[PDB]
Structure 1
Amino acid sequence: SRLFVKKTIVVGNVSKYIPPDKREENDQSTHKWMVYVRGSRREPSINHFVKKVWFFLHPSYKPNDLVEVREPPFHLTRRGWGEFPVRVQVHFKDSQNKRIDIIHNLKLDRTYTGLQTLGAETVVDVELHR
């Protein structure tokens, strides 16, 4: 009675610098970034319990500032110039598990090599009714 399991959810992002000769005209974006929602390496895939993920972006991305991803991978790739707090809202398959908001501070590459680098990861434990 009142049984639960804990599962790890990791929100992270990677990015790469885009040199000027590879930038779209009148896009001020200096980077290509990707935010991901994954599980720990030591646990089963989160697709077993995650229904869908909403990514809330900074208003500069309007009218495309709310992006729904229903199937894995729960990845979102965009170009940009600025770091901002990404709100990731995780929805679970089992209705008994309420949605959670995770705020991930987007971290952009500063090596400027044009290679992809790891930016940041935000780790939370969630509770799943059993």
Structure 2
Amino acid sequence: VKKTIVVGNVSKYIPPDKREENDQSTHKWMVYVRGSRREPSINHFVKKVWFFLHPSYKPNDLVEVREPPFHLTRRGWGEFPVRVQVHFKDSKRIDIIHNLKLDRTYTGLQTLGAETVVDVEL
């Protein structure tokens, strides 16, 4: 019946020397869809997830993940709203907007950006 869905992102700063010749991206970010802290795995009631990205990611601005974990990894230089559509196995689809937050430690280590928490009724 009642389930918690968390859409979050981590990111790491890419130091200037470690950036690819043809890629001016400052960060590598990962958006994730998980359950509660108590039940992080959502594979048993989530069929797949669609990630709707910023137009700059065209033609790959819509990414489908059907196999857990429900993660998307990309490089970028900007914060934008990531639209996440979660498809449930029994019943139905819900849209979650996650405002991507990029690392400001500038350590080059992966840090938690932000988490968007929603309660779904099913």
> What TM-score do the two structures reach when normalised by structure 2?
0.96
Q: Give the aligned length.
A: 122
Partner of 2:72: 76
Residue 115 (structure 2) pairs with residue 112 (structure 1): no
User: Compared with structure 1, are the counterparts of its residues 34 and 44 closer, same or farther at alpha carbon in structure 2 (3 Å cutoff)?
Assistant: closer
1:7 CA displacement: 0.2
8 Å Cα contact 2:8/2:33 also seen in 1: yes
Structure 1 segments, 4+ long, off by >2 Å, are none
1:44 CA displacement: 6.6
1:27 CA displacement: 1.1
Residues 54-97 of structure 1 show CA distances to partners (whole Å, capped at 9, x for unaligned) of 000000000010000001100000111000000000001114xx
Query: Highest Rg: 1 or 2?
Result: 1
Give the Cα separation in 2 of the matches to 1:33 and 1:116. Answer: 8
Give the Cα separation in 2 of the matches to 1:16 and 1:44. Answer: 22
RMSD between aligned residues: 1.0
User: Compared with structure 1, are the counterparts of its residues 120 and 93 closer, same or farther at alpha carbon in structure 2 (3 Å cutoff)?
Assistant: same
1:24 CA displacement: 0.7
Give the Cα separation in 1 of the matches to 2:38 and 2:103. Answer: 27
Residue 56 (structure 2) pairs with residue 60 (structure 1): yes
1:30 CA displacement: 0.3
Gaps of 5+ in 1: none
SS at match of 2:43: helix
Give the Cα separation in 1 of the matches to 2:40 and 2:32. Answer: 16
SS at match of 1:60: helix
SS at match of 1:36: strand
Residue 19 (structure 2) pairs with residue 23 (structure 1): yes
How many percent identity over aligned positions? Answer: 100
1:111 CA displacement: 1.0
User: Compared with structure 1, are the counterparts of its residues 44 and 61 closer, same or farther at alpha carbon in structure 2 (3 Å cutoff)?
Assistant: closer
1:127 CA displacement: 1.6
User: Compared with structure 1, are the counterparts of its residues 44 and 37 closer, same or farther at alpha carbon in structure 2 (3 Å cutoff)?
Assistant: closer
Gaps of 5+ in 2: none
1:50 CA displacement: 0.2
8 Å Cα contact 2:13/2:27 also seen in 1: yes
